[PDB]
Automatic annotation (TrEMBL), chains A, B:
It comes from Tenacibaculum discolor. SUPFAM superfamilies: Activating enzymes of the ubiquitin-like proteins (SSF69572). The keyword Nucleotidyltransferase applies. The keyword Transferase applies. Residues 5-235 form the THIF-type NAD/FAD binding fold domain. GO terms for molecular function: nucleotidyltransferase activity; tRNA threonylcarbamoyladenosine dehydratase; ubiquitin-like modifier activating enzyme activity. PANTHER family: TRNA THREONYLCARBAMOYLADENOSINE DEHYDRATASE. This is ThiF family adenylyltransferase. AMP binds at R7, D52, D54, R63, Q64, K75, L99, D119, S122. GO terms for biological process: cyclic threonylcarbamoyladenosine biosynthetic process.
Amino acid sequence: MKHRYSRNRLYLNPKEQELIKDYPILLGGAGIGSIIAECALRFGFENITIVDGDHVENSNLNRQNYTEGDVSVNKVEAIKARLKSINSKANIKIHNCFLTSDNVEEYIKGHKVAINALDFSSEVPLLFDEICQKMDIPVLHPYNLGWGGLVTIISPKGLSLNSIAKKGEKFNELNVVEYVSSYMRFWGKPQEWLEDIIYKFKNEREKLSPPQLSVGSWVVAGMCTHILFNIATQREIKSFPEFYLSSLEG
Amino acid sequence: MKHRYSRNRLYLNPKEQELIKDYPILLGGAGIGSIIAECALRFGFENITIVDGDHVENSNLNRQNYTEGDVSVNKVEAIKARLKSINSKANIKIHNCFLTSDNVEEYIKGHKVAINALDFSSEVPLLFDEICQKMDIPVLHPYNLGWGGLVTIISPKGLSLNSIAKKGEKFNELNVVEYVSSYMRFWGKPQEWLEDIIYKFKNEREKLSPPQLSVGSWVVAGMCTHILFNIATQREIKSFPEFYLSSLEG
């Protein structure tokens, strides 16, 4: 393997390092996704498309891959600068556009795997998955659970996130986190910390975005990079309704 | 809190965010520690001393917090640039010198907690811990097990890493990792992936450095940041001979 990937040896053979070099990844959302991108790029995934329409805001600096100088710049331009200073020969393609029902299919075309890191602020997170399912593109959903990282993979032929939604109210990340906490408690592995942060958040008077910590961001980037390597080299993975949860206590 | 730490709420209360702000951390080794440094800084730990005498090499870019432009510069020079570009008002103190039997005590002096990321090929890895114990400074030992992140905390009045070192024969990280696999297997939780890479590494024809992956670095960085929050806030911690092991398979 190359001198940059020298310490990747034994874990990866030359053909695997070679394989993931060109494996086209689509990353929707450069927030939690900006941490994911760096870890995956350094691992050896050199073909990443990143789509995001926001600018870098101050509140991102506690958990996202941006600097004080990046604030107010389009995230996609900022994360490409960070990524291309890590690997100049990498194929980092960005598109500074919001995903809508009309354009989302055209961006997805051409990718072998996708990471859905989209805010539920529009109705595109789930439609994004439907298009990926139809096209044999597995979808990673990373979540920042503060102390923990959560990843679930929507597999093309498996259940979609729709299965946890009730059709009368809109579905966001709080429903995913509540599903995970209830599953753990039901199966005898209760995550009392997760239920604790869920309770605190619900009893907040004002409606604010969910809190997140750098630790969960860093953990979930590692989980995602691993999952990407397993999907690209066709190693077994859990598909939704199964998920991966990683935290200091296991 | 600041708008930079805005999204930290509920997980940390304002009084904790202030406390860890000045909580003096000593980081011995800016390799795996460079990933730890960014995650811990963004969390809110703003008082970090970094000691390392090495320069950035090509093999670092697959798992360490450096860029192509940083290559051939002192790691300590590069990581302060990265960290101080994330937080300009942060208190990031570096020392471009290797640790020896004579200077290691004076570097330790003044910190409430330390992160021992010293190569076991230097002279001071175990002596570093003894001095910290003498001073009631807990020591985090983070390791990159490829797919997993491993942290063990030497607490001042508890067992040191000496307990797994053999009297008369040299001690390195392979002894730590072989202990973890044996302990895990002893408790009925064998990590066969870990045992596999250890076997592969020992039966290497050539004598080379251990392989490491970006996945474990990012995971261990999150673990270390969580542990640091617990140590500063006087939350319970697992001490050596116990440890924290985090991986996708777990």
